[PDB]
From Swiss-Prot, chain C:
Belongs to the WD repeat PRL1/PRL2 family. WD repeats lie at residues 19-58, 61-100, 103-142, 145-184, 187-227, 228-266, 277-316. Involved in pre-mRNA splicing as component of the spliceosome. Component of the PRP19-CDC5L complex that forms an integral part of the spliceosome and is required for activating pre-mRNA splicing. As a component of the minor spliceosome, involved in the splicing of U12-type introns in pre-mRNAs. The chain holds residues 184 to 503 of 514 of the full protein. GO terms for cellular component: catalytic step 2 spliceosome; fibrillar center; nuclear membrane; nuclear speck; nucleoplasm; nucleus; Prp19 complex; spliceosomal complex. The keyword Phosphoprotein applies. Its main location: nucleus. GO terms for biological process: mRNA splicing, via spliceosome; positive regulation of G1/S transition of mitotic cell cycle; protein localization to nucleus. The modification Phosphoserine is found at residues 18, 208. This is Pleiotropic regulator 1. The lineage of its organism: Eukaryota, Metazoa, Chordata, Craniata, Vertebrata.
Swiss-Prot record, chain D:
The lineage of its organism: Eukaryota, Metazoa, Chordata, Craniata, Vertebrata. The chain holds residues 669 to 1168 of 2335 of the full protein. Plays a role in pre-mRNA splicing as core component of precatalytic, catalytic and postcatalytic spliceosomal complexes, both of the predominant U2-type spliceosome and the minor U12-type spliceosome. Functions as a scaffold that mediates the ordered assembly of spliceosomal proteins and snRNAs. Required for the assembly of the U4/U6-U5 tri-snRNP complex, a building block of the spliceosome. Functions as a scaffold that positions spliceosomal U2, U5 and U6 snRNAs at splice sites on pre-mRNA substrates, so that splicing can occur. Interacts with both the 5' and the 3' splice site. Widely expressed. It is found in: Nucleus; Nucleus speckle. This is Pre-mRNA-processing-splicing factor 8. The MPN (JAB/Mov34) domain mediates interaction with TSSC4 and SNRNP200. Has structural similarity with deubiquitinating enzymes, but lacks the residues that would bind the catalytic metal ion. Contains a region with structural similarity to reverse transcriptase, presenting the classical thumb, fingers and palm architecture, but lacks enzyme activity, since the essential metal-binding residues are not conserved.
Curated annotation (Swiss-Prot), chain E:
The modification Phosphothreonine is found at residue 23. It comes from Homo sapiens (Human). This is Spliceosome-associated protein CWC15 homolog. Residues 1-10 have a biased composition (Polar residues). Identified in the spliceosome C complex. Component of the PRP19-CDC5L splicing complex composed of a core complex comprising a homotetramer of PRPF19, CDC5L, PLRG1 and BCAS2, and at least three less stably associated proteins CTNNBL1, CWC15 and HSPA8. Interacts directly with CTNNBL1 in the complex. Component of the minor spliceosome, which splices U12-type introns. Transmembrane segments: none annotated. Belongs to the CWC15 family. Residues 28-54 have a biased composition (Basic and acidic residues).
Curated annotation (Swiss-Prot), chain F:
It comes from Homo sapiens (Human). This is SNW domain-containing protein 1. Identified in the spliceosome C complex. Associates with U4/U6-U5 tri-small nuclear ribonucleoproteins (U4/U6-U5 tri-snRNPs). Component of the minor spliceosome, which splices U12-type introns. Interacts with SKI, SMAD2,SMAD3, RBPJ, RB1, PABPN1, MAGEA1, SIRT1, FOXN3, U2AF2, DAXX and ATP1B4. Interacts with PPIL1. Interacts with VDR and RXRA; preferentially associates with VDR:RXRA heterodimers. Interacts with NCOR2. Interacts with MAML1. Interacts with NOTCH1 NICD; the interaction involves multimerized NOTCH1 NICD. (Microbial infection) Interacts with human papillomavirus type-16 (HPV16) E7 protein. It comes from the Eukaryota. Involved in pre-mRNA splicing as component of the spliceosome. As a component of the minor spliceosome, involved in the splicing of U12-type introns in pre-mRNAs. Required for the specific splicing of CDKN1A pre-mRNA; the function probably involves the recruitment of U2AF2 to the mRNA. May recruit PPIL1 to the spliceosome. May be involved in cyclin-D1/CCND1 mRNA stability through the SNARP complex which associates with both the 3'end of the CCND1 gene and its mRNA. Involved in transcriptional regulation.
Amino acid sequence: VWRNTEDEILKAAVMKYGKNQWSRIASLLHRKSAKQCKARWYEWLDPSIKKTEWSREEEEKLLHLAKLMPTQWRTIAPIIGRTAAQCLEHYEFLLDKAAPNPETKPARPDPIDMDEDELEMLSEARARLANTQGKKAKRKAREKQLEEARRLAALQKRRELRAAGIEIQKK
Amino acid sequence: EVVLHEDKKYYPTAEEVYGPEVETIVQEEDTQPLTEPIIKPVK
Amino acid sequence: TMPKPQWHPPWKLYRVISGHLGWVRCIAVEPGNQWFVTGSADRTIKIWDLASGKLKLSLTGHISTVRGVIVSTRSPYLFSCGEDKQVKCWDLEYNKVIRHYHGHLSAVYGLDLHPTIDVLVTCSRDSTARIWDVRTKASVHTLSGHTNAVATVRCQAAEPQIITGSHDTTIRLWDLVAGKTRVTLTNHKKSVRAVVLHPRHYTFASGSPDNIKQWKFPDGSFIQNLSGHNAIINTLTVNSDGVLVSGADNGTMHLWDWRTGYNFQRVHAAVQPGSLDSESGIFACAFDQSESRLLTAEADKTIKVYREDDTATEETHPVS
Amino acid sequence: AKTVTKQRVESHFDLELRAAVMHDILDMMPEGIKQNKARTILQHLSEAWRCWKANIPWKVPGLPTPIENMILRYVKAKADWWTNTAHYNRERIRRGATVDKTVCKKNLGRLTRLYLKAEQERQHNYLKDGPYITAEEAVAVYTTTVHWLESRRFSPIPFPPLSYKHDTKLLILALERLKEAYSVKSRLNQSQREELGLIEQAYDNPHEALSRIKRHLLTQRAFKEVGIEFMDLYSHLVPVYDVEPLEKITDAYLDQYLWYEADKRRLFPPWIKPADTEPPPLLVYKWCQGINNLQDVWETSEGECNVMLESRFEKMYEKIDLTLLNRLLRLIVDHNIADYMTAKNNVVINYKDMNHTNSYGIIRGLQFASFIVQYYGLVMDLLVLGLHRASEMAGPPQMPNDFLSFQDIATEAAHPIRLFCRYIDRIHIFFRFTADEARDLIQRYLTEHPDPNNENIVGYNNKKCWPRDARMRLMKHDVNLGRAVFWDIKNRLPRSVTTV
Amino acid sequence: QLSKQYSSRDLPSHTKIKYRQTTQDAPEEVRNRDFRRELEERERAAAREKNRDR
Amino acid sequence: WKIPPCISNWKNAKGYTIPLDKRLAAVHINENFAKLAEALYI
Amino acid sequence: NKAPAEVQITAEQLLREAKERELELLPPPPQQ
């Protein structure tokens, strides 16, 4: 199942990495694979998916289509602009008023005390999102700090060495 | 009057884009095999 | 104003050849006028008959776009030049490469042949030209001095013997023996991709998106402008009767009068069926040897042949 | 100044292409004076190319037209280069010239992308130019099938009952078949690990499994997305479909149940022949042996003529229409299972980063696809033979016939079609004509396709493997009879359903 | 500053230039010829042959 | 002549956050489906 | 104790936490 913490990580992860690097994002999350993340995005968390009430024109067109092209909900869904799970639930519901897969369901909210792992993930998600920088390049930056200590140490020690009275030449 | 995707004519044909009198050659693979010199030598 | 321009008849398209699988980038006619040769961005060199338009033969040696071909008037040789930095000499009694000129450091954009001595000149994107010895494949001079790709080169027997136009918007007139630039012409504001020499007048013209300009040898004294064609101009080609063809890169082609600079026709041809309309463009044009036909090599993989119109008169098509 | 060899062909193509682009407009159609941003137009160029490759419609909100035309022109340049290289390498791989192992993988990836681009275009054209099957071909098909099933006294398949006796046997068979993939117990992956987990826990607790299965078959009609990839057989490729585990189990059980019941109620008449009764070499033997046991078959006195035709339905898996298929399945099974089966072929197909929706054909990587293919082929056997001759061949429903036998000799000789075999989508027919039936056929053929210039002898294709003393001898009566027979058969099939 | 290095491909090869012989197309003949009329001749011939085609 | 910047869905070289909306932006049905489906029901 | 939390852990909060984790800017090269 899907927990509000996780899909709130997923919104940010998609916001940062892009809409095509599902394995990276899947790595941000514990206990999720890239297939499930992609499914959850394309079924519920996409901002272009409508969760509203069916306008009367929507419902008439839905029944119209469901008669023109029966059981083809992936074909029908974009013709009216909602996901196939919504169209399927609402169509059966219309038929009965006149008579799993957890991607689709909403997210269980956050508890009062978040289980420890729920918390460390957030910190580490915060960790990953914060750092734009690479590894090699970061090593060079740390080395640059190291190098100013080197020159800085050498000079004072060189000053002191030549101050002690010995005029060393490196070469 | 349904056109099987096997036909699906895009792309107006050449005579319609160029005109009734402009000639139109389409030359895929050539005549005159490669061994035949373009400039023939003397003998 | 001007005296009034000579009346030239207008030209009409009468043939459309299509067998290439990439843009057609260069075109040339044999000395004896029986066949012409096209080089394309599908790395072949096709040889077509000029009467029938039939394809005679297909030569495949290059590794990338063939950007120039030429046929030598003194020897049975065809010299081709590609984007693979290689320059080739095909012997046309066996149809096989016999000689290759090595040393350019990036794609070779064009090439011309000296009419009396046996040398080659090639221009490339490393912003140099080279004078090759046809017979020993040795580079006898590296004409350097431009500061950007060298779009075009033309060579002549008179003096100065080499004119290069480059993408830093400059023209240079070089001497062949000394190997250095005599004159530098900086009148154009945009890349000079086209240069042509009048057959019988010791003058030349140079094309750029600003306007075509005319210059007068041997030290390049300005003469006049030719304006109106606002397009990246890929070619210029002059007839012996003073017709000057200016082929652009969006497909449009203007025909001018050389002497007074009066644009007497504007052709806007149509793209081959399966083409986009963003893919109309002229890369090379060449007059026949009789100077009756005008062949053009286009960015929709066709070769269009124009012939002069014989049933028009000064009063049917007056000169403004 | 090192040459451009074979490892630097691609990197060099891109060097020179983007040098050209930078020359081209970003310095010769400017007047974005300040700083003409050419380093960013090159970014647009690379992204337009990736969008071409992914089959995405690329349109940037406010971008001057000259630039957009420049980019479209150059992406068409690179696309021509890319696919011409694919054509060339594919011919080398097919005939056998290169063994390089990076070219094999590069080329399989190129042709996978080319196939999926053509395929998304074919589905869009379906949904735009509408069902290719008119409402009068489809009604003839539907009514002919109802007449068949009614004359046979078929007994439709019911939804698998609650206390079915065989549910555990059908489930054990499904799960054993699914295990058979990972016999090796290889390095597999996460997803096969997960499938093995599901299979084992269903092998331990077989009633939560079956409860789930029937709940699915009853209520589910929108499924997850399928993966596709290609198996490279060096002379053609094969598509390989990748479905998710929960549904693979539900489909495997549905498959077993349908084939079991179909075989008990006798849905498929004896000519639909990848059958469980003999291996293919025994089919060849029974065919040779049935031809020979026809009555007076080798006699040529009165000018009789035997014709053996063999063909292929040329794409039946690809022009199935899911609406018509729904209605044709409903005649056979419960509407619940019919709706499951036809709502399951309509899924999203995904390769690396290309995605589309199946709406027209059939996904053969499903587990009941055998049943759909053979039932649809049954409908087409009926269109080709006619209900009367199909009822002669299949015998009366109380006393069905064997593979290639008839009830008596009277019926067998009452018609030219003496034998008929249909492998999955392959057709073999054997006719025996008398001289008048043959002459009549040839007349009606020549009336409509008149060949006065005697080139019918030319298109005819023979088998250049036996010596000429054993090949076919092309006399005009003979090749004309061949063309007439073929012309007559390919006229019984609407071209919007299947062809030949 | 001339090197003594050397190359397998800089050995002498094709050391004589072929010149275009008397019949092939020497600059003398093409200096002579009348091209427009010859071209229209072969053009008419080709149209004749291809109407014989059909 | 101003050139919009590219935000790709594949390359994020410098690791920059872009809101979902701007990240995002950068069908026909014939009328014979009705005649076919209703002919089948009848 | 599992029980519905009070406010939530919506994304913008994460992006702000990461942006404020601003330690990779680091300290300036020391003036001497």
